[PDB]
Amino acid sequence: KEMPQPKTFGELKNLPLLNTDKPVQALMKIADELGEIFKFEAPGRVTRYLSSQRLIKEACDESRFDKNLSQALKFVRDFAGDGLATSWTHEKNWKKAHNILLPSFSQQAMKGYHAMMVDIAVQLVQKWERLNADEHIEVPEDMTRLTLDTIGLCGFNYRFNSFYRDQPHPFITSMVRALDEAMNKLQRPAYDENKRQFQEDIKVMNDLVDKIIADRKASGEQSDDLLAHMLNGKDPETGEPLDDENIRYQIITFLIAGHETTSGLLSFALYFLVKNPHVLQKAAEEAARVLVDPVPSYKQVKQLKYVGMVLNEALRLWPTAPAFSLYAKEDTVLGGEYPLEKGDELMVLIPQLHRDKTIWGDDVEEFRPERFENPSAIPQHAFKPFGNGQRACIGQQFALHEATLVLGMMLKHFDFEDHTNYELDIKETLTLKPEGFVVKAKSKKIPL
Ligand code: HEM
Fold first, then answer.
1. Can you say which residues are annotated as belonging to the binding site?
2. Coil, helix or strand at residue 427
3. Where is this site: Important for catalytic activity?
4. Cβ burial 184-213 (10 Å sphere, 16+ → b, else e)
5. Integer Cα distance of 16 and 203 in angstroms
6. For the CA atoms of 22, 25, 27, 30, what is the dihedral angle to 10 degrees?
7. CA-based nearest residue to 351, from 360, 338, 340, 341
8. Whose CA is nearest to atom 43 of ligand 1?
9. What would the DSSP string read from start to end of 285-348?
10. Residue nearest (by alpha carbon) to ligand 1 atom 3
11. Pocket residues for ligand 1 (CB within 6 Å)?
12. Which of 158, 178, 286, 305 is the most buried if burial means most Cβ atoms within 10 Å?
């Protein structure tokens, strides 16, 4: 079969279709029109967008396809280097760092981070407890304060102190602007200026982290956090530790990857909850039932099953890292009808996969956490908000524990009002979030 292709613009092929504020949402609409697979051409390159479980289950075959670095990751690599997320599977530093860091996300591990997650969560709850009568909450803004601070602290014993500030840490300023620059390049001497902003932003991140690192190294203080592993750990395979250059790239990688998608998730979860008050009520009832002490235990967070389902349903509809790229390891045939050559690229459009009616049924647009009651019933590779195989999200357990803890405490401590009847507006960076989402929270007056 010859695959569908969306409208073209002469020499530019399909490229101008990505010249928009919301390219992922544009691609979802294109998938709606064209179906499970479509070719997308630009000057110099081609990729194929996949939307069905039927074809994505094959794309996820690691014997046939490996992770590809999208043009976007490639631009990010300019400051994330060969950190885990921006490295090729075949680079020595990918396997090394992967082996050395995996244990920092073991069960013994989330247990060790729990206390510090609670430290930041409590700061969130106290902020909301201290609001005056008719004030409101800027949701993603506050969720980003929480997720950033949580990775900074749990990961490296560094306090960004986001809740003591109105404006951003000088890191995010440097960081967001870099990502901004990074994204922007997607479409482009007129341009000598952004480069200096870029190199300066880059300089901000490195100098901090590089001190964050030799600061620790010298004092020699005794920890067991992420940094501790990046500094002391040895890859069982090569027997080698990471060097200081890669260590810094990992910190930059985790700070970024370790908060933006997580803030998005919390923001979408709260949005779906206020839009579906019966679901909010069911989740609030679990929170009250389970969280019987002033602050949650690790064991209690594990018992917030319905909260966990709410979070998976939010990831179904709006996975906050909405796409990942692959390349063919050898010539192969996709789905029995699409011949591929070695090197050919695929893109997995996760929000479309999560709307495949053959898997989820007709009601795919409805928010129903109960879909996740029996996870064993879900076919392979049908739900993929954390990517695939050995290149899947190493931070998955960290993200879900933090989100479940925080949303649990939120539902325990406040009732929520959608006071503006907020109209969902999804802003696209490298991730997704509901821009301008606000709520009012009424305290239940339960002390910490
Ligand atoms: C809801 C929150 C998150 C979502 C939806 C998410 C999503 C993803 C996805 C889809 C990938 C695969 C990327 C690709 O194939 O190109 C990935 C990789 C990765 N993520 Fe996450 N992520 C989340 C949170 C986190 C957190 C909290 C951390 C760190 C604490 C993190 C660190 C990483 C790293 C290091 C990789 C690359 C791993 C490797 O290739 O070895 N992510 N993430």
1. 49, 393
2. strand
3. 261
4. eeeeeeeeeeeeeebeebbebbbebbeebb
5. 33
6. -120
7. 360
8. 393
9. HHHHHH--SSS--HHHHHT-HHHHHHHHHHHHH--SS-EEEEEESS-EEETTTEEE-TT-EEEE
10. 261
11. 67, 84-85, 98, 151, 253-254, 257-258, 261-262, 265, 319-321, 324, 385-387, 391, 393-395, 398-399
12. 178
User: Resolution of the experimental model in angstroms, please?
Assistant: 1.9
Stated length of the chain: 448
Report the C-alpha gap between 385 and 398 in whole angstroms: 14
Sign, CA torsion 274/280/281/285: negative
Extract the tokens encoding 49. 């967008």
* Distance between start and end Cα atoms, the chain: 62
Closest by Cα among 325, 371, 375 to 350? 325
| Known binding residues for (9Z)-hexadecenoate | 49
Q: What residue numbers bound the domain in which 216 lies? A: 1-448
Residue 87 Cα: closest atom of ligand 1: 40
Number of domains in the chain: 1
DSSP secondary structure letters along 126-147: HHHHT--TT--EEHHHHHHHHH
Tokens of 365: 């647009």
The method recorded for this entry reads X-ray
Buried b (16+ CB within 10 A) or exposed e, 105-137: beeebbebbbebbbebbbbbbeebbeeeeeeeb
Distance of CA 393 from the midpoint of ligand 1 (Å)? 4
If DSSP codes are grouped into helix, strand and coil, which group holds residue 200?
helix
Q: Which residues are catalytic?
A: 261, 386, 393
Tell me, what CATH number does 100's domain have? 1.10.630.10
- 70 CA distance to ligand 1 centroid (A)? 15
Binding residues for heme: 393
Please identify which residue in the block is written with the tokens 């480069």. 195
